[PDB]
Amino acid sequence: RRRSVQWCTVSQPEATKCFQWQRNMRRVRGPPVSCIKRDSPIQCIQAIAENRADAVTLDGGFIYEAGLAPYKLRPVAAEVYGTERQPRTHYYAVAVVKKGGSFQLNELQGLKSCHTGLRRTAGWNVPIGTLRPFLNWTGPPEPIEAAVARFFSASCVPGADKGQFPNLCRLCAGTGENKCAFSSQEPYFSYSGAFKCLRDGAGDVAFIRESTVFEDLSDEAERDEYELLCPDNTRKPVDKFKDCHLARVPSHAVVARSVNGKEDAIWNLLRQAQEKFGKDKSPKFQLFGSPSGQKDLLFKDSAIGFSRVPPRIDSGLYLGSGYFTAIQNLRKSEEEVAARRARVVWCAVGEQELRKCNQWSGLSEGSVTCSSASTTEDCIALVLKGEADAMSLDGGYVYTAGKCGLVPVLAENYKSQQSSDPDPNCVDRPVEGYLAVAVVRRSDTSLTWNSVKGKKSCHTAVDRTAGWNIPMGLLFNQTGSCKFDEYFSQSCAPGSDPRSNLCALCIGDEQGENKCVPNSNERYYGYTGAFRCLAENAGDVAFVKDVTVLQNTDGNNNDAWAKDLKLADFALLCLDGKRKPVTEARSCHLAMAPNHAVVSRMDKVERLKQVLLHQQAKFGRNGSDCPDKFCLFQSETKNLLFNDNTECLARLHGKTTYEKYLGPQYVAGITNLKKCSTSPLLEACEFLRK
Ligand SMILES: [Fe+3]
Ligand SMILES: [Fe+3]
Ligand code: NA
């Protein structure tokens, strides 16, 4: 499987460094590494895709391209920049000009520009995006490049087609067939090459990264001949880039295959080479250093190391919602872009949720369409990737979403703790929260809270509130043990490892497949599912909510299993040792659980609010188009999409973040449990926040 990593190159100078690295690794008896010779980034991406190479560092822009249809690569290790005191995995895209003229970012038409390359991050993807309003581009078949050519009088944009767009290669200084080329041959290529374009005075502006003026000018006197164009039509010095930049973007990263990518071997070689040939490690070879006339050979010069990129992260999540969809927008009209801007894409966990969602989309008047995934976490990933937008989450999943940057918008407002009748001001009524309780059969009279451990259990699903966070949370306060799979003997807790004791009692869907998956296909998933687990004498205790018991007994649920059950056949376990009836939950419950909340991005908050409020006026609880057509909070006690016992989606009253909504100490509770184990998505977002 691994005994030599193949590193793809794009240049003769680049191949020579590759060979140096090869023989210095041999010099020190460390990890081997072969070298491949190609002529361009796209060729190396193809190379890796057909097992003819292993890995290649690529700019943000080419991470996107490397992750699409045929190839499907992913970032396995990102570059690190800045100082050892303050390492970062991100850089800034700026626009450096000379000192003299008095123009601004909005006064660039008619001027001459100096870019790094086509489809690069700082060089194309950001500048063209910031300047789109000024381009007067009409949209598709006409390439965006064409509009740029009319904008700037002349410029050098390596990689551009000289023949179709001659204006974009006027100021490049290559000779013959090397003019406007995507290689070192063309003098004004990459960061240092584009600042040289500024230098010579060919261009008037140069779109590069922030550290480029510091890398090429020695004395601090030569740097005071340059300022930075700002988004707010202002000029400032080259050291105030923090407060003056076009964008904030991910760093370049070593990519590789998704399926058999030899991730292990890539990281092993990179860390070893980071330790023996990193920042001033050995004068006989420099990993992050190149000869005089060359620049940024195999990795970025003046880099300080690598930093492993977590398994769950893909091309898109890496690039982040802001930059990822911006790349996507360059291949779209202004009409298509603002149209997506104003529609809400709900995510659906499971085919059953998906089916209810399509019904809603048909009657939404094109304000809602749907996406889908097999689990809750996968759907959160989709909102970060910009493919989806919103979704109703249980308090437990609000934390995970919370640490991935999403925020709460509207929360489910269940019938109040006996306050009013079908409340008119439900939308402005503050949320009271629901009650987490434990449930058992009457016949088993010896079962109490002090002896529930050891018996079979019926959970909703892992990382949910009443199902997991609270029951395991109290049991953790006592024992302290992080092994949650020994608390109960056998149990059904969807989301857990299927060959685990935690999935032993699950039964899957009607065919017998899908055991212990955390969507509604599992018969015993969710509140209704956990109670079902109880009633059928699969488990002994079942951690759901009070109203779940009510809603599934005394003929309130006409399905096969719940047809003949009655409310008096069930009791609740109290913390003191006592047991009461289900109606006495107010005085016999484990803890208060905060309401479910519909979350989205910070950029989709205002439109999502005016849409949900409108759609609920139509298909709500007291909705005008209710029974006849469709109802949002109605799916026949399966809780598809929203909870059935939801009155209305309500405002949060200033609790606008995951911290303020859940509550200080609820967040404390979750974190402690997460110390024993984090999810791959939790590990993913943690990387991206740094
Ligand atoms: Fe870059
Ligand atoms: Fe809940
Ligand atoms: Na690089």
From Swiss-Prot:
Annotated region described as Interaction with PspA, given as residue ranges: 19-26, 37-38
Gene, per the UniProt record: LTF
Protein name in UniProt: Lactotransferrin
Role summary: Transferrins are iron binding transport proteins which can bind two Fe(3+) ions in association with the binding of an anion, usually bicarbonate. Lactoferricin binds to the bacterial surface and is crucial for the bactericidal functions. Has some antiviral activity against papillomavirus infection. N-terminal region shows strong antifungal activity against C.albicans. Contains two BBXB heparin-binding consensus sequences that appear to form the predominate functional GAG-binding site.
Region span, Bactericidal and antifungal activity: 1-9, 19-29
Region entry Interaction with lipopolysaccharide, spans: 19-29
Subunit and interaction comment: Monomer. Found in a complex with LTF, CLU, EPPIN and SEMG1. Found in a complex with MPO and LTF; interacts directly with CP, allows Fe(3+) incorporation into LTF and activation of CP ferroxidase activity.
Residue pairs linked by disulfide bridges in the UniProt entry: 8-44, 18-35, 114-197, 156-172, 169-180, 230-244, 347-379, 357-370, 404-685, 426-648, 458-533, 482-676, 492-506, 503-516, 574-588, 626-631
Residues the UniProt record annotates as site (Important for iron binding): 209
Domain of life of the organism encoding this protein: Eukaryota
Family: Belongs to the transferrin family.
Enzyme class: hydrolase
GO biological process: antibacterial humoral response; antifungal humoral response; antimicrobial humoral immune response mediated by antimicrobial peptide; bone morphogenesis; defense response to Gram-negative bacterium; humoral immune response; innate immune response in mucosa; iron ion transport
